Amino acid sequence: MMTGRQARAPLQFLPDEARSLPPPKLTDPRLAYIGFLGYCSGLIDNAIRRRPVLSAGLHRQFLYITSFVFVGYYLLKRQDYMYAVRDHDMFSYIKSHPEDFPEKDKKTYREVFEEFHPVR
Amino acid sequence: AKTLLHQYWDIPEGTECHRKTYAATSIGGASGLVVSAYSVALKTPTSFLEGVARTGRYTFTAAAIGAIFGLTSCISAQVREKPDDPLNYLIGGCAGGLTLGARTRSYGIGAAACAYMGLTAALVKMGQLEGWKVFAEPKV
Amino acid sequence: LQYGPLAYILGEKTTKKMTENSKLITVDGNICSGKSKLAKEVAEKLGLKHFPEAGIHYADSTTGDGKPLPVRFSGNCSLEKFYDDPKSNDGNSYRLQAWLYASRLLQYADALEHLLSTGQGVVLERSIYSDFVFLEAMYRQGFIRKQCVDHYNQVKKVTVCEYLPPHVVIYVDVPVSEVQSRIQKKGNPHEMKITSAYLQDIENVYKGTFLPEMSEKCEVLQYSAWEAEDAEKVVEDIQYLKYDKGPWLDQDDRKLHNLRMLVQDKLEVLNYTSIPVFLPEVTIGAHQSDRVFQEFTELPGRKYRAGYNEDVGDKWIWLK
Amino acid sequence: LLDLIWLETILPKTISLAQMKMSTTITSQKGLIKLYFLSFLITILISTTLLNFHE
Amino acid sequence: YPTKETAHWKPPPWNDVDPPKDTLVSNLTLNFGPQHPAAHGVLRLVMELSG
Amino acid sequence: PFFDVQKKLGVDLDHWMTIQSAEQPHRIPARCHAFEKEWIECAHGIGSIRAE
Amino acid sequence: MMTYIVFILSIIFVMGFVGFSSKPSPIYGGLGLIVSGGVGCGIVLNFGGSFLGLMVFLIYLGGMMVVFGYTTAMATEQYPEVWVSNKVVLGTFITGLLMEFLMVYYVLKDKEVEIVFKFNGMGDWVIYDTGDSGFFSEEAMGIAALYSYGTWLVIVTGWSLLIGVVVIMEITRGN
Amino acid sequence: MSLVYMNIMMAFTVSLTGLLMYRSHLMSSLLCLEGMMLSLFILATLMILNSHFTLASMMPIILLVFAACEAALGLSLLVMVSNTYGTDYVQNLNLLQC
Amino acid sequence: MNPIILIIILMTVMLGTIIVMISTHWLLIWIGFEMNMLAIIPIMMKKHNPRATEASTKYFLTQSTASMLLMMAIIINLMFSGQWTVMKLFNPMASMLMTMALAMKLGMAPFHFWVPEVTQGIPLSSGLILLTWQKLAPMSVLYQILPSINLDLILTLSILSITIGGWGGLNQTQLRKIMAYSSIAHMGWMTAVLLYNPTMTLLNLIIYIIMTSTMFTLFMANSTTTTLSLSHTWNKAPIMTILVLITLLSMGGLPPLSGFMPKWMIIQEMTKNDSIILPTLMAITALLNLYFYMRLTYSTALTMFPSTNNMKMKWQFPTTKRMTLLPTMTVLSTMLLPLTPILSILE
Amino acid sequence: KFYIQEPPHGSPNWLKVGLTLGTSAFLWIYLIKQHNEDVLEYKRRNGLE
Ligand SMILES: CCCCCCCCCCCCCCCCCC(=O)OC[C@H](COP(=O)([O-])OCC[N+](C)(C)C)OC(=O)CCCCCCCCCCCCCCCCC
Ligand SMILES: CCCCCCCCCCCCCCCCCC(=O)OC[C@H](COP(=O)(O)OCCN)OC(=O)CCCCCCCCCCCCCCCCC
Ligand SMILES: Nc1ncnc2c1ncn2[C@@H]1O[C@H](COP(=O)(O)O)[C@@H](O)[C@H]1O
């Protein structure tokens, strides 16, 4: 869809204008969900290799959680960047083409005639 | 076979039953020839005589389905005097299903194909009416 | 892990340590051939590592503390019950033979892992190429059925083709009469109930099917019983054999690398012992396997991987 | 009659038998290279002549 | 779901390895006959060449 | 996934055989050099949908 | 009809393709493909590509010599089919020949034809350029640019040939 | 377009249908793959020499390389048919039907 | 096989796919496909049995035929456009030939006839490479040429692929043919939303790669080639039965599992373009795929088929396989649906 | 002393534990450093001081 926007700055995971946006917080529930996915990954890795699931390899569980948070932070940055690009292109296109986006004259319900369909 | 479908649909329902019956017959015959071509493709018949026997059998089965379909649909549209009405194609699809069950020599496949082909032909008539797009052009 | 393709690339070729003492040698013979110490004597003069004959509890002796598990956890089979009732209704005959074939397959994998890692030849007793002869006797005496032989031939066909024969196969010529005399003098009350035709069938598939089909791919050293009592004869002949037959000659680093990779993963070794062929001798039902597996998990040192059990003294689990 | 056989017949059993029939006919292949590439030929010639997919 | 055609289909082997089906290699039988500049007048070598 | 590495790294692997209007050996022009150059300079950056 | 010489060489080209497409035997398949590859270097040479026709001649000569050796050693039966030993060879051989001369007739009677594309019927001499290329044939300079310009093309082609030898020796090993 | 492209595209279609309809014989279809590469060579080289687009004159050579660089692959995949089986008949290649 | 030669051959497979992905030139695209095929043939012949030779022969014939059709599409592009830019095509005949070539390279129906045979012939890791990594280069070419792809052709290939790959898996007890007909159905799913929104095509490609790699990694970690040997998994390591339960319920398209993500999003982009009949028929046809996934979960996790005695030995040896990224792939293939708006990283 | 064969995961691989802990600590501190630079850049490009 937006492949012509990233056709002048190719393969930039986060462009220069991505830094105009507020970053995801450290307590971001999307990022916290990815951290819980890291905890689940550590528990599955302890389970399938016949380790005690909650005790064995606290460093290994901790690096699973940390690695998922470290990848998911930049993934959320790119997500919020591309939705900001979506909204920016939408609003600039509406602002540049006024005749294709007419301001609808809102009629109030005292003029609007709706057919009444009774339930009987 | 893009224009077989066009020369079927471009004629008003319940007006000229012969040309509609022949158009649906040719659509059914083309479909039967495609089924026959893949049938001799994937499963080798025992000889060329058996191959053209299977080709003619599938072609005449599907052509009889198309013929009795177009005949029954246009005759029902004439005797009911309601062209834009998928009950006509429900009756025509049931006649085509009974045709398939007669050619395959089983009443159960005839009744099941009656029901499902009648529903299918009704849905095709409704798609012709409201303009339902099955291969829709991308707009957004 | 320790060994893999990465250690193979960086310089660890297995023919760098393959010397002429690195010879896998398997001693064969009947039930009381006197090979039981002879093989150790063949192991003690050449400096080879002796592996005793894998009974029911070889896999129990390798894992855990090396002590045998109870018979409901390993095998579900009894040798003395086979001696007392060979034609049993529950089919302990082929179930026992299948468990013995699995234990010998694990033993032969241990022999090859020792030979390819430590570079030292291994003395076995009755490796997997000599298992089937007992099976054949158990078909000739009507002890098992033909579908049991078909199941064994399928397991053998998909397992033994991945493995090499021994270098030296030491057979001992003991007739049935001296075997009977040593069993009567042996002192085991269960071992005396063996019929004579069973031992005769074992000697027949020894001398008619096993030793002919091995001699192409190894070098047999067939001896009698009195010169089996002199093991310096046997070592004295092993030290002067000219290894020219068998598929051991066309073995470079790559083929033995793939052999050492296949060998060191014991579940891949045992992958086709438990094939899904439903036979009433080996098929344990759902609730019985559930009960036995849940009892196996509750065992000391068996709940987890071999360095992750608090009950047997594995420290530092939270950093492993 | 109805709620053990016929209402049991019309939606689930006829659908189950139809999908089983098509599953047997699709996967009844002899695995020959000749018939597969002959079917590829028939597909391309239906695509050109009979469906006008090159238009 | 076995039909009439899919009834001789035995299941494939466990290790996906088939028996080698040792059909005859047909060693080409050369008649290095007596009329030859190398066979000294009278020598019929019936030889079996593998190529 | 046109992972445009060649524009990202600035290396030139196959932007040279791509059109007839490119730098040719010994400055050889094609028979349709001017037509292709005019259509490329017409359709540059205006997109496919407007360019066609 | 001498101005149509690329056309006549192309008729012999398609007749060679009918020769090895009917597949009698790879001996005669190699025969027909050598005939077609030896008239293809006469089709393409009248456009100026003498080097680039001599090479498709030479590479396919080496190819058919190797394919000869393999079909004499592997793809060999007792009675090889020439074109007439099997009716399924001869029927589609005659069919391809009659359809090729049929579309010769339909293009020299009308001077246009339309199978899928629309084709002219005048001889292809009309579309040449009216200029001279100086002291170089331009196809020679373009194929000489494979080293100065086509570095990446050289790298991927040589790497494909190296691993093609590696691939072929790993396949034909068995163990 | 020009007259010669009729017969060169016709030769591509003839080698296509020669490849795409087997005759229980694999070397005869590897020959049809080589013929399809020949027709693609002749067609692309006619167009490139027609355009005087000289820089892609190295394009058919490279094309030709990968022609034999797959066709030799077919030959190396032929002997593995013919060492297991007696011949290269494609009806011996039906063991993956179960 | 030498491990050095295995590393070289896998890097050459990756190199061919990267050359298809990054290049701007059609000859370079065709070189990438030739290099990918040539390098992947010894991955299919890793063990040297007649099944691998038959599988590699069928795969070589299909991909060589597809490469021929692809180069003819390239040459007709060269004629009717005079250039070589990997972009839209300038002739519907070349677009049809290229779409046929890529449908043969993907094994989409009615060109599907090689995927279960080649997948059944070769081992599980080479089948994994075939069903995941080889589905990347032709989908790159389909992403790059979509202003010229005919609508009715790719939609016919898509829905016929979904129906035929649905009916294919319902008669299978070998796991590799199950995953192969699943691949045919899911390539139909990927290419159906191609001309509507190809970001959803890339999303379905990524989620299918993750789920398929999870299933083949579980199959390698349990050494299972048949359904009835996958049904012995409860007696050996019962956590693997839970993992195959959650992954096979994920691949069927049940919420809250992540395999509901692509399909729904595909419908989310097909109904915007006023197509309602076609995603409805596709979604109803996906119930067949879910049916044979339910069959495999009935075999493995939900029931307990009677195992054999020698399983008692395999209790005494834990798995020492290198299970590469198995918990990560399982978590991403089951618990990613609340992160559904992450798909904008593909925009 | 229990196991008759010394298990590979009997003693902890202290090099692997050290690499795990150091890599995870570096990922956390580089993540916090990148987050602080990002909040500074966002407050700088707009002037929300
Ligand atoms: C439990 C057993 C029975 C199950 C019955 C389930 C419901 C049966 C009917 C479902 C129809 C399909 C979904 C309709 C969604 C309509 C949304 C919409 O916008 O409609 C207007 C749109 C109209 O298009 P539009 O809205 O884009 O266009 C604008 C409006 N006009 C037309 C005026 C220009 O309708 C359609 O596009 C067609 C809808 C019907 C399609 C029928 C196909 C399915 C056939 C029957 C399937 C039956 C169940 C299948 C499973 C059975 C078991 C395997
Ligand atoms: C059934 C089996 C077959 C049985 C019959 C076999 C008959 C004998 C076949 C052997 C001869 C094959 C000849 C093939 C073409 C060789 C091309 C050639 O001669 O090239 C040399 C030369 C290159 O020099 P150039 O750079 O072109 O110079 C011109 C500018 N100063 O080029 C020139 O000087 C060009 C001069 C004009 C060339 C005319 C066009 C080519 C004519 C081809 C005729 C048909 C060849 C058939 C080959 C079949 C091989 C078996
Ligand atoms: N495959 C087998 N079948 C029957 N008995 C066996 C088998 N393998 C080993 N044995 C027994 O192992 C013992 C070997 O004898 P000894 O060498 O005296 O320990 C005898 O009791 C044999 O019966």
Coordinates of C-alpha atoms in Angstrom, one line a residue, chain C residues 56-308:
Chain C
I56 CA 17.4 -56.5 30.5
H57 CA 19.1 -53.8 32.5
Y58 CA 21.9 -52.4 30.4
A59 CA 20.0 -49.1 29.8
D60 CA 19.4 -49.0 33.6
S61 CA 23.2 -49.4 34.1
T62 CA 24.1 -46.6 31.8
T63 CA 21.7 -43.9 33.2
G64 CA 20.9 -42.8 36.7
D65 CA 23.2 -44.2 39.3
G66 CA 23.8 -47.4 37.3
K67 CA 21.6 -49.6 39.4
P68 CA 18.9 -51.6 37.7
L69 CA 15.4 -50.2 37.6
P70 CA 12.4 -52.4 38.7
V71 CA 11.2 -54.7 36.0
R72 CA 7.9 -52.8 35.5
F73 CA 9.9 -49.7 34.4
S74 CA 12.4 -51.4 32.1
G75 CA 11.4 -54.3 29.9
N76 CA 8.3 -55.7 31.4
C77 CA 10.0 -59.0 30.7
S78 CA 11.7 -61.8 32.6
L79 CA 14.3 -64.3 31.5
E80 CA 13.5 -66.9 34.1
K81 CA 9.8 -66.6 33.3
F82 CA 10.8 -67.3 29.7
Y83 CA 12.7 -70.4 30.9
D84 CA 9.8 -71.6 33.0
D85 CA 7.0 -71.1 30.5
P86 CA 8.4 -70.4 27.0
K87 CA 5.0 -70.8 25.3
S88 CA 3.3 -68.3 27.6
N89 CA -0.1 -66.8 26.9
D90 CA 0.9 -63.2 27.6
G91 CA 3.8 -63.4 25.1
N92 CA 6.8 -62.7 27.3
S93 CA 9.0 -64.4 24.7
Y94 CA 9.0 -61.9 21.8
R95 CA 8.6 -59.0 24.2
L96 CA 11.7 -60.1 26.0
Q97 CA 13.5 -60.6 22.7
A98 CA 12.5 -57.2 21.5
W99 CA 13.8 -55.6 24.7
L100 CA 17.0 -57.5 24.4
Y101 CA 17.4 -56.3 20.8
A102 CA 16.9 -52.7 22.0
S103 CA 19.4 -53.1 24.8
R104 CA 22.0 -54.6 22.4
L105 CA 21.4 -51.8 20.0
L106 CA 22.1 -49.3 22.8
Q107 CA 25.2 -51.3 23.7
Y108 CA 26.4 -51.4 20.1
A109 CA 25.9 -47.6 20.0
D110 CA 27.9 -47.2 23.2
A111 CA 30.7 -49.4 21.6
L112 CA 30.8 -47.2 18.5
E113 CA 30.7 -44.0 20.5
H114 CA 33.6 -45.2 22.7
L115 CA 35.5 -46.4 19.5
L116 CA 35.0 -43.1 17.7
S117 CA 35.5 -40.7 20.6
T118 CA 38.1 -42.3 22.8
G119 CA 39.8 -44.1 19.8
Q120 CA 39.9 -47.4 21.7
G121 CA 38.6 -50.8 20.5
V122 CA 35.6 -52.3 22.4
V123 CA 35.0 -55.9 23.3
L124 CA 31.3 -56.8 23.0
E125 CA 29.5 -60.1 23.7
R126 CA 26.7 -60.9 21.2
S127 CA 26.2 -57.7 19.4
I128 CA 23.1 -56.9 17.2
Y129 CA 24.3 -59.0 14.3
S130 CA 24.0 -62.1 16.5
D131 CA 20.7 -61.3 18.2
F132 CA 18.5 -62.8 15.5
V133 CA 19.7 -66.4 16.1
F134 CA 17.9 -66.5 19.4
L135 CA 14.8 -65.2 17.6
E136 CA 15.2 -68.0 15.0
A137 CA 15.4 -70.6 17.7
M138 CA 12.3 -69.1 19.3
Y139 CA 10.5 -69.5 15.9
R140 CA 11.8 -73.1 15.4
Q141 CA 10.6 -74.3 18.8
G142 CA 7.2 -72.6 18.3
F143 CA 7.9 -70.2 21.1
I144 CA 6.9 -67.1 19.1
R145 CA 4.7 -66.6 16.1
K146 CA 5.5 -65.6 12.5
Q147 CA 4.2 -62.0 13.0
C148 CA 6.8 -61.6 15.8
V149 CA 9.5 -62.6 13.4
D150 CA 8.1 -60.1 10.8
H151 CA 8.1 -57.3 13.5
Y152 CA 11.7 -58.2 14.4
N153 CA 12.7 -58.3 10.7
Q154 CA 11.2 -54.8 10.1
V155 CA 12.9 -53.4 13.2
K156 CA 16.2 -55.0 12.1
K157 CA 15.8 -53.9 8.5
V158 CA 15.4 -50.2 9.5
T159 CA 18.0 -50.2 12.3
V160 CA 21.0 -52.5 11.6
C161 CA 21.5 -51.1 8.0
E162 CA 22.8 -47.8 9.6
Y163 CA 25.6 -49.6 11.4
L164 CA 28.9 -51.4 10.6
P165 CA 29.9 -55.0 11.4
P166 CA 32.6 -55.8 13.9
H167 CA 36.2 -56.2 12.9
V168 CA 36.8 -59.6 14.6
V169 CA 34.0 -62.0 15.5
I170 CA 35.2 -64.7 17.9
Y171 CA 32.9 -67.8 17.8
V172 CA 33.3 -70.7 20.2
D173 CA 32.5 -74.3 19.1
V174 CA 30.7 -75.9 22.1
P175 CA 28.3 -78.7 21.3
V176 CA 25.0 -79.2 23.1
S177 CA 26.3 -81.9 25.5
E178 CA 28.9 -79.7 27.2
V179 CA 26.4 -76.8 27.4
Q180 CA 24.0 -79.2 29.2
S181 CA 26.8 -80.3 31.5
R182 CA 27.7 -76.7 32.4
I183 CA 24.1 -75.8 32.9
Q184 CA 23.5 -78.8 35.2
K185 CA 26.7 -77.8 37.1
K186 CA 25.9 -74.1 36.9
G187 CA 23.5 -73.9 39.9
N188 CA 20.7 -71.8 38.4
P189 CA 17.4 -73.7 38.8
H190 CA 15.6 -71.7 36.1
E191 CA 18.4 -72.2 33.6
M192 CA 18.2 -76.0 33.7
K193 CA 14.7 -76.0 32.2
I194 CA 16.0 -75.2 28.7
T195 CA 15.0 -77.8 26.2
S196 CA 17.8 -79.5 24.2
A197 CA 16.2 -78.6 20.8
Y198 CA 16.3 -74.9 21.7
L199 CA 20.1 -75.1 22.2
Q200 CA 20.3 -77.2 19.1
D201 CA 18.5 -74.5 17.1
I202 CA 20.7 -71.8 18.5
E203 CA 23.8 -73.8 17.4
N204 CA 22.2 -74.4 14.0
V205 CA 21.5 -70.7 13.3
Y206 CA 25.0 -70.0 14.7
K207 CA 26.7 -72.4 12.2
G208 CA 24.4 -72.2 9.2
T209 CA 23.2 -68.6 8.9
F210 CA 25.2 -66.2 11.2
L211 CA 28.8 -67.2 10.7
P212 CA 28.4 -67.6 6.9
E213 CA 26.8 -64.2 6.5
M214 CA 29.3 -62.4 8.7
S215 CA 32.5 -63.8 7.1
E216 CA 32.1 -61.6 4.0
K217 CA 32.0 -58.4 6.1
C218 CA 34.3 -59.3 9.1
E219 CA 36.9 -61.9 10.0
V220 CA 35.7 -64.9 12.1
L221 CA 38.0 -66.6 14.6
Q222 CA 36.1 -69.8 15.4
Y223 CA 37.6 -71.9 18.2
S224 CA 36.7 -74.9 20.3
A225 CA 36.0 -75.0 24.1
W226 CA 39.4 -76.1 25.3
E227 CA 41.4 -73.5 23.4
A228 CA 38.9 -70.9 24.5
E229 CA 40.3 -71.6 28.0
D230 CA 43.6 -70.3 26.7
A231 CA 43.0 -66.7 25.8
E232 CA 46.6 -65.9 24.9
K233 CA 45.9 -68.1 21.8
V234 CA 43.0 -65.8 20.9
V235 CA 44.9 -62.5 21.5
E236 CA 47.9 -64.1 19.7
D237 CA 45.7 -64.6 16.7
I238 CA 44.0 -61.2 16.8
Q239 CA 47.3 -59.4 16.7
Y240 CA 48.1 -61.0 13.3
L241 CA 45.0 -60.7 11.1
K242 CA 45.1 -58.9 7.8
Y243 CA 42.0 -56.7 7.7
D244 CA 41.0 -56.7 4.0
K245 CA 37.3 -57.5 4.0
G246 CA 34.3 -55.6 5.2
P247 CA 33.0 -52.1 4.9
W248 CA 35.5 -50.7 7.4
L249 CA 38.2 -50.1 4.7
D250 CA 36.2 -47.5 2.7
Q251 CA 35.7 -45.2 5.7
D252 CA 37.0 -41.6 5.5
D253 CA 36.4 -38.8 8.0
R254 CA 33.0 -37.9 6.6
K255 CA 31.3 -41.3 6.8
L256 CA 32.6 -41.9 10.4
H257 CA 31.5 -38.3 11.2
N258 CA 27.9 -39.1 10.2
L259 CA 28.3 -42.4 12.1
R260 CA 29.4 -40.6 15.2
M261 CA 26.6 -38.0 14.8
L262 CA 24.0 -40.8 14.5
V263 CA 25.5 -42.8 17.4
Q264 CA 25.8 -40.1 20.0
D265 CA 22.0 -39.3 20.0
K266 CA 20.6 -42.3 21.7
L267 CA 17.0 -41.5 21.0
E268 CA 17.8 -41.4 17.3
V269 CA 19.6 -44.8 17.8
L270 CA 16.4 -46.1 19.5
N271 CA 14.1 -44.3 17.1
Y272 CA 12.9 -47.4 15.3
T273 CA 12.8 -49.9 18.2
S274 CA 9.3 -48.6 19.1
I275 CA 7.7 -48.6 15.6
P276 CA 3.9 -48.4 15.5
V277 CA 3.3 -52.0 14.5
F278 CA 0.5 -53.3 16.8
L279 CA 1.6 -56.7 18.0
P280 CA 0.1 -58.3 21.2
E281 CA 3.5 -59.0 22.7
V282 CA 5.0 -55.5 22.7
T283 CA 1.9 -53.3 22.7
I284 CA 1.2 -51.9 26.1
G285 CA -2.2 -50.2 26.4
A286 CA -3.0 -46.6 27.2
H287 CA -3.8 -46.7 30.9
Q288 CA -1.0 -49.1 31.7
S289 CA 1.5 -46.9 29.9
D290 CA 0.1 -43.9 31.7
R291 CA 0.4 -45.6 35.1
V292 CA 4.0 -46.8 34.4
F293 CA 5.1 -43.5 33.0
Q294 CA 3.7 -41.5 35.9
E295 CA 5.4 -44.0 38.3
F296 CA 8.6 -43.5 36.3
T297 CA 8.5 -39.8 36.7
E298 CA 8.2 -40.2 40.5
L299 CA 11.5 -42.1 40.8
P300 CA 14.6 -40.7 42.5
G301 CA 16.7 -38.9 39.9
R302 CA 14.3 -39.7 37.0
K303 CA 11.9 -36.7 37.1
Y304 CA 14.0 -34.3 35.1
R305 CA 17.1 -34.2 33.0
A306 CA 20.2 -35.7 34.6
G307 CA 21.6 -32.5 36.2
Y308 CA 18.3 -30.9 37.4

